[PDB]
Amino acid sequence: TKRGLTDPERAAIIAAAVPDHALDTQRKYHYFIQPRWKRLSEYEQLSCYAQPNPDWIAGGLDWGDWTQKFHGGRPSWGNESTELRTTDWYRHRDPARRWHAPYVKDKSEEARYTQRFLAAYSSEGSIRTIDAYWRDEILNKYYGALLYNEYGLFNAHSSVGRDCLSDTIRQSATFAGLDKVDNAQMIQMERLFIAKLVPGFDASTDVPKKIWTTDPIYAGARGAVEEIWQGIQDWNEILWAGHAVYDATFGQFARREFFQRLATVYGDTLTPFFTAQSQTYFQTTRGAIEDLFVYCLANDPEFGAHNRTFLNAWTEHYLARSVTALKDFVGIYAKVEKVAGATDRAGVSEALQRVFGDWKVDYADKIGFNIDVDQKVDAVLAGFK
């Protein structure tokens, strides 16, 4: 009922009690955190050292052992959860400097613009110029089937969210997982929108699910996703094999080079709107993943050859599994109308060259991996009809 700001008696008592001078001169919050940039930022101040870690985990400030542990003696957090080693697990910085408030701000802006655009597009009647075969078969079936790839890559983050050894890495992983699930939900939203525009269009997931689980074209995709989801436990390996190898090749090809490019040669004005959101999410996640796995782990002062050894082995294995997935997927070009420079063998060859060269420059040169782009292109094109 009574407050200490507005009550005259309590305000007078508090004013009498409060000292007339400051008792300390340092007013910066957590001044002892080392800044990555010129000055300490709010993201670092609110983020770093929130996880209480003893001194036997690198970079920790506490002491002693955990108060409670698993049955049998497993620690709450330990060094046994990953193969890679470092002198400090508190070194990772997100390039975009995202904590909760700016993140939700950006996603809210995107969600309100999406609704406005859908209302205007529905009012304007732009669906009439779309190619009937493309919309009826290719989009409705295979674009819907890509949903489960997105969902599996999303579910791969459950163990990373629990076993991670830092507090900035936890935020980065959580945001990446939320981006993947948002991509899946956006694909389903586009299918539902097209179902209310065009009569006879089915937005149910039965046919896309049957394609995902049974059709040969995606046979090589499922496999890879499955081993990344329920096949490994090391959180660093999950992050690397999911975002830096498999996605950056197969998902980049399927999203950018088949669906977005062929929409713009078949007169589709709706798909690029969602594909742009997918690509923006991919680039934002790529910045953080590249920072973590190149600046901190592969370029460690003490370790780094050890980490490079493990990273090269992982890259070999999962690049083989991504090349298998791509060679399997490339058989979809027999179901589309032929367009010179895009659908014939030359267009696919240049598309694969672009994807593999971009991946080379982005990751392989920085890690130390040796790749021959021509061999990969021929290996994938061996499955061309």
State both tokens at 172: 């980065």
**257 contacts 353 by C-beta, under 8 angstroms:** no
Which residues, 6 or more positions from 139, have their beta carbon under 8 angstroms from its beta carbon? 194, 259, 268, 271
If one asks whether residue 264 binds a copy of itself (CB under 8 A), the answer comes out as yes
Number of residues that bind a copy of itself (CB under 8 A): 45
Q: Which of residues 275-334 bind a copy of itself (CB under 8 A)?
A: 276, 279-280, 282-284
**352 contacts 377 by C-beta, under 8 angstroms:** yes
CA distance 138 to 115: 25
Long-range contact pairs involving 264-267 (C-beta distance under 8 Å, separation at least 24): 265/339, 265/342, 266/130, 266/131, 266/134, 266/337, 267/129, 267/130, 267/131
Instruction: Point out which span in 38-46, 81-89, 115-123, 197-205 binds a copy of itself (CB under 8 A).
Output: 115-123
Interior angle at CA 134, CA 131 and CA 140, nearest 5 = 125
Which of a copy of itself, other proteins, none binds 205 (CB below 5-8 Å, type-dependent)?
Answer: other proteins
**166 contacts 89 by C-beta, under 8 angstroms:** yes
Q: Which of residues 159-188 bind a copy of itself (CB under 8 A)?
A: none
If one asks whether residue 123 binds a copy of itself (CB under 8 A), the answer comes out as yes
Indicate which single residue of 263, 289, 323, 348 sits in contact with a copy of itself (rule: CB under 8 A): 263
If one asks whether residue 135 binds a copy of itself (CB under 8 A), the answer comes out as no
In the complex, minimum distance from the CB of residue 238 to a copy of itself, in angstroms, rounded to a whole number: 24
Burial of 3 (0-12, 13-18, 19+ CB in 10 A): exposed
* Per-residue mark of binding to a copy of itself, 356-385 (x: CB under 8 A): --x---------------------------
In the complex, minimum distance from the CB of residue 352 to a copy of itself, in angstroms, rounded to a whole number: 14
Which residues, 6 or more positions from 65, have their beta carbon under 8 angstroms from its beta carbon? 54, 75
In the complex, minimum distance from the CB of residue 328 to other proteins, in angstroms, rounded to a whole number: 17
If one asks whether residue 260 binds a copy of itself (CB under 8 A), the answer comes out as yes
CA distance 293 to 175: 17
Report the C-alpha dihedral over residues 226, 146, 259, 133, rounded to 10 degrees. 130
Instruction: Point out which span in 6-14, 69-77, 314-322, 366-374 binds a copy of itself (CB under 8 A).
Output: 6-14
If one asks whether residue 12 binds a copy of itself (CB under 8 A), the answer comes out as yes
If one asks whether residue 9 binds a copy of itself (CB under 8 A), the answer comes out as yes
| Nearer residue to a copy of itself within complex by CB, 171 or 260 | 260
Which residues, 6 or more positions from 304, have their beta carbon under 8 angstroms from its beta carbon? 297, 298
If one asks whether residue 109 binds a copy of itself (CB under 8 A), the answer comes out as yes
The residues of the shown chain that bind a copy of itself, judged by CB under 8 A, are 5-6, 8-9, 11-12, 15, 106, 108-110, 112-113, 116-117, 119-121, 123-126, 128-129, 256, 260-261, 263-269, 272-273, 276, 279-280, 282-284, 342, 354, 358
